[PDB]
Design a binder for this molecule. Structure first.
Ligand SMILES: Cc1cc2nc3c(=O)[nH]c(=O)nc-3n(C[C@H](O)[C@H](O)[C@H](O)COP(=O)(O)O)c2cc1C
Ligand SMILES: C[C@@H]1c2nc(C(N)=O)cc(-c3ccc(F)cc3F)c2CCN1Cc1ccnn1C
Length: 387
């Protein structure tokens, strides 16, 4: 009769208990770095989603009613949508910040502008950028700026009659049209001497050509007078203002906005089909009412796995990106394995519903077991690491 529901209900109960435990430990330690650095708000939205996956079991084991059918269609897509929107936004946050790529191309004869470049690069990698420093002799003009979020061009001033660019930088300057400059966020730097009429004339020449090319000049170029080693405060100070180009911060309020929008998209699909195809009684629409709902979640997961794989090497918040990666790879394995299972068990409603319950629970279990279990281990057993 209802013995088929012992297995699913036991799982859902233990899973809801485990989710309330994980929430509790997180809230108890809400101000500690492990809980704050991870993009806190998103982690709460995720546990809510996971708790809902376990709650789905009760709604599927309960007797079909117009309300039960509404909630079955409403909840199944939404519960998963809450999980994967939280996971996508977390990955987007990592990608947007540690994603950003900077390129520094310097021109130096005595290595002063090279030192200034070496200081800026260290500061930017510390800021979160994936810096790529190169000398103007090594660089080839064609497609040199492509795929870089930020580009810094360093060069010294020469000439014994007028402004002259550093020798390695002249071939780059003359063929700057074929570099990818238009629309690119740029900044210039260089070393000169105030004993010369045109102090850092090279910086001026490069800034003006970039303006003409259609580049986004982020800041007034850095002009180092004399020894750059004595201007470290000026050079680091400038690199601090430069780094605030591709934003290195996403507000918790903005994180919940993106997440909430991605949930809203599924809710629009699931409500739109409840309006056209009214719920009723077994449940009236067990056909292709959840097809759109499924496509939306298949998109979210695929997107999330692609971003998670791209962000896998990021060490921030105790290698979180690695564990977000693992939860997504396991989700793909689950989803791709249960798809033929639902097809072959379509003849038996009890087996079909039991499988649905087990798999929805399993999907929720890999989020707890892969993302939260390593976080809970540091919180509860390694407190010295959480301070
Ligand atoms: C012949 C010569 C011409 C220079 N012309 C200028 C100039 O017009 N304006 C300027 O501000 N500095 C000028 N300088 C100063 C250099 O740019 C300065 O020595 C700089 O620190 C060298 O940096 P680098 O090692 O990166 O090439 C000139 C230096 C020399 C030796
Ligand atoms: C198409 C729908 C569905 N929709 C979503 C979805 N909306 O994201 C997820 C799953 C699902 C995927 C992976 C897993 F492991 C467990 C799961 F439940 C399923 C499973 C079968 N189901 C049948 C159906 C049609 C109409 N009513 N129902 C109840």
């Amino acid at each position: 009769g209802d013995a088929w529901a012992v297995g699913p209900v036991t799982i859902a109960c233990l899973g809801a208990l485990a989710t309330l435990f994980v929430l509790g430990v997180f809230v108890r330690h809400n101000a500690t770095p492990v809980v704050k650095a991870s993009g806190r708000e998103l982690c709460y939205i995720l546990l809510g989603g996971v708790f809902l996956c376990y709650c789905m079991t009760f709604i599927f084991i309960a007797k079909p009613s117009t309300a039960v059918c509404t909630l079955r269609r409403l909840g199944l897509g939404t519960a998963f949508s809450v999980c994967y929107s939280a996971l996508l936004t977390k990955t987007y946050r990592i990608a947007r910040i540690f994603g950003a790529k900077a390129l520094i191309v310097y021109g130096s004869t005595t290595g002063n502008t090279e030192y200034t470049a070496e200081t800026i690069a260290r500061e930017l990698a510390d800021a979160g950028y994936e810096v790529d420093s190169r000398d103007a002799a090594s660089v080839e003009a064609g497609g040199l700026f492509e795929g870089f979020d930020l580009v810094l061009l360093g060069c010294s001033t020469w000439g014994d009659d007028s402004i002259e660019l550093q020798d390695d930088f002249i071939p780059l300057f003359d063929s700057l049209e074929e570099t990818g400059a238009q629309g690119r966020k740029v900044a210039c730097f260089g070393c000169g001497d105030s004993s010369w009429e045109y102090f850092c004339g090279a910086v001026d020449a490069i800034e003006e050509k970039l303006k003409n090319l259609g580049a986004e000049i982020v800041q007034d170029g850095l002009r180092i007078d004399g020894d750059p080693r004595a201007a470290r405060d000026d050079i680091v100070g400038w690199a601090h203002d430069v780094r605030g180009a591709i934003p290195r911060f996403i507000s918790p309020a903005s994180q919940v906005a993106i997440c909430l929008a991605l949930i809203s998209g599924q809710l629009l699909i699931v409500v739109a089909w409840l309006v056209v195809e009214a719920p009723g009684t077994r449940c009236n629409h067990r056909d292709a009412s959840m097809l759109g709902s499924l496509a939306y979640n298949v998109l979210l997961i695929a997107l999330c796995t692609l971003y998670a794989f791209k962000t896998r090497k990021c060490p921030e918040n105790f290698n979180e990106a690695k564990f977000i990666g693992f939860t997504m790879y396991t989700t793909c394995i689950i989803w791709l394995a249960f798809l033929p299972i639902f097809y072959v068990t379509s003849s038996d409603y009890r087996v079909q519903t039991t499988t649905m319950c087990v798999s929805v629970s399993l999907s929720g279990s890999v989020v707890l077991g892969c993302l939260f279990a390593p976080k809970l281990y540091i919180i509860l057993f390694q407190p010295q690491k959480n301070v």
